[PDB]
Design a protein around this motif. Structure first.
Motif, PDB file in Angstrom:
ATOM      1  N   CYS A  61      17.137  26.205  21.785  1.00 56.28           N
ATOM      2  CA  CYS A  61      16.044  25.471  22.417  1.00 56.28           C
ATOM      3  C   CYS A  61      14.675  25.695  21.735  1.00 56.28           C
ATOM      4  O   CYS A  61      13.633  25.274  22.269  1.00 56.28           O
ATOM      5  CB  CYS A  61      15.957  25.856  23.903  1.00 56.28           C
ATOM      6  SG  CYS A  61      17.452  25.464  24.834  1.00 56.28           S
ATOM      7  N   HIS A  62      14.679  26.370  20.581  1.00 53.75           N
ATOM      8  CA  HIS A  62      13.441  26.679  19.857  1.00 53.75           C
ATOM      9  C   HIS A  62      12.786  25.398  19.395  1.00 53.75           C
ATOM     10  O   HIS A  62      13.467  24.419  19.015  1.00 53.75           O
ATOM     11  CB  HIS A  62      13.718  27.665  18.700  1.00 53.75           C
ATOM     12  CG  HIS A  62      13.803  29.134  19.139  1.00 53.75           C
ATOM     13  ND1 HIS A  62      13.906  30.165  18.255  1.00 53.75           N
ATOM     14  CD2 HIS A  62      13.765  29.714  20.411  1.00 53.75           C
ATOM     15  CE1 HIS A  62      13.943  31.331  18.930  1.00 53.75           C
ATOM     16  NE2 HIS A  62      13.860  31.053  20.252  1.00 53.75           N
ATOM     17  N   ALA A  63      11.457  25.371  19.459  1.00 53.37           N
ATOM     18  CA  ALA A  63      10.689  24.186  19.076  1.00 53.37           C
ATOM     19  C   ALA A  63      11.132  23.617  17.738  1.00 53.37           C
ATOM     20  O   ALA A  63      11.254  22.390  17.563  1.00 53.37           O
ATOM     21  CB  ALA A  63       9.193  24.518  19.056  1.00 53.37           C
ATOM     22  N   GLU A  64      11.416  24.501  16.786  1.00 52.87           N
ATOM     23  CA  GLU A  64      11.861  24.045  15.474  1.00 52.87           C
ATOM     24  C   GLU A  64      13.189  23.295  15.583  1.00 52.87           C
ATOM     25  O   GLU A  64      13.418  22.330  14.838  1.00 52.87           O
ATOM     26  CB  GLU A  64      11.993  25.217  14.484  1.00 52.87           C
ATOM     27  CG  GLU A  64      10.799  26.159  14.443  1.00 52.87           C
ATOM     28  CD  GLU A  64      10.891  27.208  15.506  1.00 52.87           C
ATOM     29  OE1 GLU A  64      10.661  28.392  15.188  1.00 52.87           O
ATOM     30  OE2 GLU A  64      11.214  26.849  16.658  1.00 52.87           O
ATOM     31  N   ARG A  65      14.057  23.727  16.500  1.00 52.08           N
ATOM     32  CA  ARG A  65      15.374  23.063  16.676  1.00 52.08           C
ATOM     33  C   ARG A  65      15.180  21.676  17.295  1.00 52.08           C
ATOM     34  O   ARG A  65      15.774  20.681  16.846  1.00 52.08           O
ATOM     35  CB  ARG A  65      16.309  23.920  17.530  1.00 52.08           C
ATOM     36  CG  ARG A  65      16.796  25.193  16.848  1.00 52.08           C
ATOM     37  CD  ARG A  65      17.981  24.917  15.923  1.00 52.08           C
ATOM     38  NE  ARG A  65      19.072  25.878  16.135  1.00 52.08           N
ATOM     39  CZ  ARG A  65      20.287  25.572  16.598  1.00 52.08           C
ATOM     40  NH1 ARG A  65      20.617  24.319  16.895  1.00 52.08           N
ATOM     41  NH2 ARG A  65      21.189  26.531  16.756  1.00 52.08           N
ATOM     42  N   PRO A  92       8.674  31.543  12.696  1.00 51.10           N
ATOM     43  CA  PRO A  92      10.058  31.222  13.079  1.00 51.10           C
ATOM     44  C   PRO A  92      11.057  32.373  12.945  1.00 51.10           C
ATOM     45  O   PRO A  92      10.999  33.155  11.988  1.00 51.10           O
ATOM     46  CB  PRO A  92      10.433  30.083  12.135  1.00 51.10           C
ATOM     47  CG  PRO A  92       9.478  30.164  11.003  1.00 51.10           C
ATOM     48  CD  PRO A  92       8.214  30.730  11.555  1.00 51.10           C
ATOM     49  N   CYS A  93      11.976  32.470  13.911  1.00 54.75           N
ATOM     50  CA  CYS A  93      12.965  33.552  13.925  1.00 54.75           C
ATOM     51  C   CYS A  93      14.035  33.290  12.872  1.00 54.75           C
ATOM     52  O   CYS A  93      14.116  32.183  12.342  1.00 54.75           O
ATOM     53  CB  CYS A  93      13.577  33.703  15.327  1.00 54.75           C
ATOM     54  SG  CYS A  93      14.727  32.380  15.747  1.00 54.75           S
ATOM     55  N   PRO A  94      14.868  34.313  12.554  1.00 48.06           N
ATOM     56  CA  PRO A  94      15.991  34.175  11.608  1.00 48.06           C
ATOM     57  C   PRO A  94      16.892  32.935  11.734  1.00 48.06           C
ATOM     58  O   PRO A  94      17.171  32.286  10.722  1.00 48.06           O
ATOM     59  CB  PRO A  94      16.786  35.464  11.847  1.00 48.06           C
ATOM     60  CG  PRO A  94      15.753  36.475  12.200  1.00 48.06           C
ATOM     61  CD  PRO A  94      14.648  35.730  12.920  1.00 48.06           C
ATOM     62  N   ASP A  95      17.349  32.593  12.943  1.00 47.19           N
ATOM     63  CA  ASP A  95      18.288  31.457  13.136  1.00 47.19           C
ATOM     64  C   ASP A  95      17.697  30.083  12.848  1.00 47.19           C
ATOM     65  O   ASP A  95      18.355  29.201  12.258  1.00 47.19           O
ATOM     66  CB  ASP A  95      18.856  31.438  14.561  1.00 47.19           C
ATOM     67  CG  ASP A  95      19.034  32.819  15.139  1.00 47.19           C
ATOM     68  OD1 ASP A  95      20.167  33.130  15.549  1.00 47.19           O
ATOM     69  OD2 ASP A  95      18.046  33.593  15.173  1.00 47.19           O
ATOM     70  N   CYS A  96      16.455  29.879  13.281  1.00 53.24           N
ATOM     71  CA  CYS A  96      15.732  28.682  12.897  1.00 53.24           C
ATOM     72  C   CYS A  96      15.651  28.582  11.390  1.00 53.24           C
ATOM     73  O   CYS A  96      15.937  27.500  10.796  1.00 53.24           O
ATOM     74  CB  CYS A  96      14.350  28.682  13.528  1.00 53.24           C
ATOM     75  SG  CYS A  96      14.450  28.281  15.286  1.00 53.24           S
ATOM     76  N   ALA A  97      15.290  29.704  10.764  1.00 49.55           N
ATOM     77  CA  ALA A  97      15.271  29.795   9.294  1.00 49.55           C
ATOM     78  C   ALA A  97      16.603  29.314   8.740  1.00 49.55           C
ATOM     79  O   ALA A  97      16.649  28.430   7.872  1.00 49.55           O
ATOM     80  CB  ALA A  97      14.957  31.223   8.839  1.00 49.55           C
TER      81      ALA A  97
HETATM   82 ZN   LIG Z   1      13.864  30.022  16.303  1.00 47.67          ZN
END
Ligand SMILES: [Zn+2]
Length: 186
Positions: A61-65, A92-97
């Motif tokens: 649900c991250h904004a980047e996603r 941005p966190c690791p998974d978004c990356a």
């Molecule tokens: Zn993220």
């Protein structure tokens, strides 16, 4: 899938993008974007907007996603070069990356630059390597300076024609964060 907001109110901008301190009370991430479509050396499209999320949410649900899922429609048109710029309040966190790296591997006609107000959980190695990975993918990751905050003010805020007003320590905090990012991206 979620549509972007058009803009933030001025109170939210000043609160969410303040470049610390240490920003304990910031449990949202806010993300402003520009998307520019270029075809045959000419601008064919310009879209802007804002996504947000809680620091509580499942990573998906991250904004980047949200941006990535929204952008992947006819909003992408296979023959065009896209320049995407993000301005994020927390880095941005690791998974978004990871998701961005897959997204760009997928869509090779897209470029990306990320400006970030603050560095998220940066003492720990995961969040540093997420940033290194974006850099390796050829994504520019930059700390927001004065003109970046003013640019956001001027494009993503219901500013009522009032000018951008920097908070005390804006420039000081920028330099500290820029030093930390630089050190971490070698
Ligand atoms: Zn993220």
């Amino acid at each position: 899938i979620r549509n972007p907001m058009k803009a933030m109110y001025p109170g939210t901008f000043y609160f969410q993008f303040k470049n610390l301190w240490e920003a304990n009370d910031r449990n949202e991430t806010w993300l402003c974007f520009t998307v520019e479509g270029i075809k045959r050396r000419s601008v064919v499209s310009w879209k802007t907007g804002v996504f947000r999320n809680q620091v509580d949410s499942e990573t998906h649900c991250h904004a980047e996603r949200c941006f990535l899922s929204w952008f992947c429609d006819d909003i992408l048109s296979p023959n065009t070069k896209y320049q995407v710029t993000w301005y994020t309040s927390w880095s941005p966190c690791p998974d978004c990356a990871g998701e961005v790296a897959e997204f760009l591997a997928r869509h090779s006609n897209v470029n990306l630059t990320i400006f970030t107000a603050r560095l998220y959980y940066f003492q720990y190695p995961c969040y540093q390597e997420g940033l290194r990975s974006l850099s390796q993918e050829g994504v520019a990751v930059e700390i927001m300076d004065y003109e970046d905050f003013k640019y956001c003010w001027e494009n993503f805020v219901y500013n009522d024609n009032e000018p951008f007003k920097p908070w005390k320590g804006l420039k000081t905090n920028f330099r500290l964060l820029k030093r930390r990012l630089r050190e971490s991206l070698q």
